[PDB]
Symmetry: D3
Subunit: 134 residues, 6 copies
Amino acid sequence: LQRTLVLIKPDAFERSLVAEIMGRIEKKNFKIVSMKFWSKAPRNLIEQHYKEHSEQSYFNDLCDFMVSGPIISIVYEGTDAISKIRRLQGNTNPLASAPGTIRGDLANDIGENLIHASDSEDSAVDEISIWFPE
Amino acid sequence: LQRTLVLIKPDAFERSLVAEIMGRIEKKNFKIVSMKFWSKAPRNLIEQHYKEHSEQSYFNDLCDFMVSGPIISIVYEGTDAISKIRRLQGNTNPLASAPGTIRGDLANDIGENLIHASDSEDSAVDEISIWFP
Amino acid sequence: LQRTLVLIKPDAFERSLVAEIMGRIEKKNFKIVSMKFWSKAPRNLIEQHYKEHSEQSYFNDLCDFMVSGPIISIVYEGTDAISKIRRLQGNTNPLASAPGTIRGDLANDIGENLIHASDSEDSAVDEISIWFP
Amino acid sequence: LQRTLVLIKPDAFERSLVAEIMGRIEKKNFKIVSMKFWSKAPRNLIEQHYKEHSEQSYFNDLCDFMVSGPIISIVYEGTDAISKIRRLQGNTNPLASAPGTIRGDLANDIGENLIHASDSEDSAVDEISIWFP
Amino acid sequence: LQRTLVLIKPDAFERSLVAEIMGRIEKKNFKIVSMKFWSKAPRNLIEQHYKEHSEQSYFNDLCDFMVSGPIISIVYEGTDAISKIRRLQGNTNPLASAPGTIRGDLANDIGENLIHASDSEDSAVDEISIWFPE
Amino acid sequence: LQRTLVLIKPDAFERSLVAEIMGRIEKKNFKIVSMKFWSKAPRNLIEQHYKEHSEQSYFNDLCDFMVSGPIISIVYEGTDAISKIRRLQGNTNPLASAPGTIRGDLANDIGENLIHASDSEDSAVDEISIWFPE
Ligand SMILES: O=c1ccn([C@H]2C[C@H](O)[C@@H](COP(=O)(O)OP(=O)(O)O)O2)c(=O)[nH]1
Ligand SMILES: O=c1ccn([C@H]2C[C@H](O)[C@@H](COP(=O)(O)OP(=O)(O)O)O2)c(=O)[nH]1
Ligand SMILES: O=c1ccn([C@H]2C[C@H](O)[C@@H](COP(=O)(O)OP(=O)(O)O)O2)c(=O)[nH]1
Ligand SMILES: O=c1ccn([C@H]2C[C@H](O)[C@@H](COP(=O)(O)OP(=O)(O)O)O2)c(=O)[nH]1
Ligand SMILES: O=c1ccn([C@H]2C[C@H](O)[C@@H](COP(=O)(O)OP(=O)(O)O)O2)c(=O)[nH]1
Ligand SMILES: O=c1ccn([C@H]2C[C@H](O)[C@@H](COP(=O)(O)OP(=O)(O)O)O2)c(=O)[nH]1
Ligand SMILES: [Mg+2]
Ligand SMILES: [Mg+2]
Ligand SMILES: [Mg+2]
Ligand SMILES: [Mg+2]
Ligand SMILES: [Mg+2]
Ligand SMILES: [Mg+2]
């Protein structure tokens, strides 16, 4: 029984795909443990979530996009939640994300990709404590 | 341009209809301005939310049901949000709720009806202050 | 808590709308208690099912249509199943059937209307005994 | 068996609701007989399409909106297409449009209402000749 | 033109995914030849359907689950129906079943996996004769 | 930013999957640049579109099927539109087209496969000029 951190990005709200994305996870039978809505995440919170990408050239545009609209932070719980939800998510690249996945079906840009999902146990614990410090 | 208070009831979670419901409101172009997830709402918030029904026969069952599962409290914003979302919601009674409405399509019980929505400007103001103080 | 008799008509199969129809009833929380697939219903079951229309002008076309493809007979159970599913069904006439109802959304002919549903306690009892003796 | 004129408005494109709308009509069994995509409809076609509203207060905003994005003009054919598709469409006013209708479900503005549909035999004949001469 | 045996398992009825599953097959354009509804399959009928798994450690739980609710037995017919419907079904394992498949989209357990589908010509003939002895 | 040619084939209209197919592309966020409806494409226009398959044994049946009903020609525009829409389309073969793709989900025949999509830059330019000579 694992717990994973998921972010509904600003492009979801702009395109009205919020329920679509959450429904795909809900239908997979994953249970919401914690959920927080942000009218606008603080840039610092974002920079922390993506601290691994600070040296990348897209870092600043990435941070700019993540504060350009509302965000929903969610902790999903279930057996092997981390890897499973990653597979539902789909590849970061629009040239690779398979049809049937969230990105494969709905995302068309490598930056604006609708959804974040922790990629491992270590980073899950880490990202859960960033969005739900309590 | 109004704001209304919406509750996603425990039966929505039990039946995995959370996204479905929020989806029907999202497609009508209403924007979220506040949202909070309750693994279990405090008994007293529920009793105050339904303070008007405190002397009604179903009151106790109504509250028991409201704390029997998680709920989501949501403030929706849009032009004439209150009356419009009430329209989406559908009648409390399964015998009167019209197909195409949330309850008319999905709900089959007068008590377990999936969704709450403020019924007026004044009540919306109270209910909003109850869940987001 | 009632039981009602539902027929999935041949035009549902021709248009691949079988799951769609059964889906709208399933989402309303009604449970199946009996189900039988007919690659071709016997002419006499049809004529008895519609025994009330035997002297009507459309009777022959109605029966011809009912045996022109497969059908599914289903007994649904739920609190007030008869009136509620009738509501989901929608008016026989394409001019009167409301959007959000099965026929109102999907059907476009007074004869080929996709679905049958008992219209009362008494008729439901007969129709159920016709298809599941 | 009638033919009616349908316009898929710019807000359908902006909100990616094009397929959704055309889908609701396709499921009702109406067939396309003519279709044309306009990256930007000519101002004069719009003003003639709405020639009846030329003296109304909203006329200018209505036209500005109609040329602010792409549109799709479609001739639909089916038995009683005009009145039926009008029914699918739903009331112009967000306060009156019923859930289950196109506008009632998706639209939230009296001006930006996603879809146009001829309102009579005579008007359908004019509107059809305007977009497909 | 092949015929294959399909079972809608008890978890479908509990979660109200019956129409969802059948609709995915219907949209693929497969035709129903035979269909039987069981309020509760007899354990023996189940033990026969899974006679190959009698020595497995999950056999008894498997049988217990299969009689815990209603079941729909269906014979679908179409060109290469057996292999095609298997691919729609998706892997038994939730760590493998791909998004876009029935299990990949809706199943989250290796036991409660919503749907059975014959895996070959031999077993199809065999399973069809178990549920439709006529 | 590429442009690709897409054809909604006669089997889509017969089965009422027109909106379904276009919606999958629309949700992927591809923009319609040009669109033409044909009550019946001229056989010659079809023979040109498939001039590469003139020596194949299915050529004539292919052409017969393509004029057996209405067709919608569409130019979609977007980054890498050609390869992406191909992946949404799915393999020509029903034994290969993956679930989650258009053909994988809806097509069950190798001939009647619902949708055409240019396979490269060269053929896109070529097919766009066939259906939209202007
Ligand atoms: O070349 C890239 C790689 C990533 N990102 C953005 C998108 C992604 O959501 C975020 C973090 O990258 P990742 O962790 O590799 O993506 P994922 O979200 O798939 O883990 O950085 C880019 O804009 N360009
Ligand atoms: O006879 C009744 C009436 C209402 N309720 C419950 C359901 C409803 O959600 C809540 C409040 O009732 P309401 O405000 O009259 O209904 P609505 O929620 O439609 O405003 O009380 C019952 O259990 N039994
Ligand atoms: O003018 C008519 C009326 C009815 N029927 C067919 C359609 C209907 O399914 C069946 C039985 O009619 P009904 O019981 O009056 O309609 P419903 O099925 O809505 O109860 O007869 C016609 O073909 N023409
Ligand atoms: O008060 C109004 C009434 C109408 N319109 C626009 C919306 C409508 O699409 C168009 C034509 O109006 P109509 O023909 O009366 O509405 P409908 O489109 O429902 O026939 O004018 C407005 O902007 N404001
Ligand atoms: O490790 C396992 C393997 C299988 N099963 C159950 C699920 C499956 O539905 C049934 C038969 O197994 P299978 O034939 O290998 O699965 P499939 O249904 O994918 O053919 O046994 C388990 O509970 N645990
Ligand atoms: O063995 C075959 C191969 C192809 N075709 C038809 C289907 C296809 O749509 C068309 C062109 O073939 P293709 O370009 O290889 O298919 P695709 O549309 O996947 O590019 O010829 C057949 O009928 N049989
Ligand atoms: Mg990562
Ligand atoms: Mg109240
Ligand atoms: Mg009758
Ligand atoms: Mg007008
Ligand atoms: Mg097996
Ligand atoms: Mg090719």
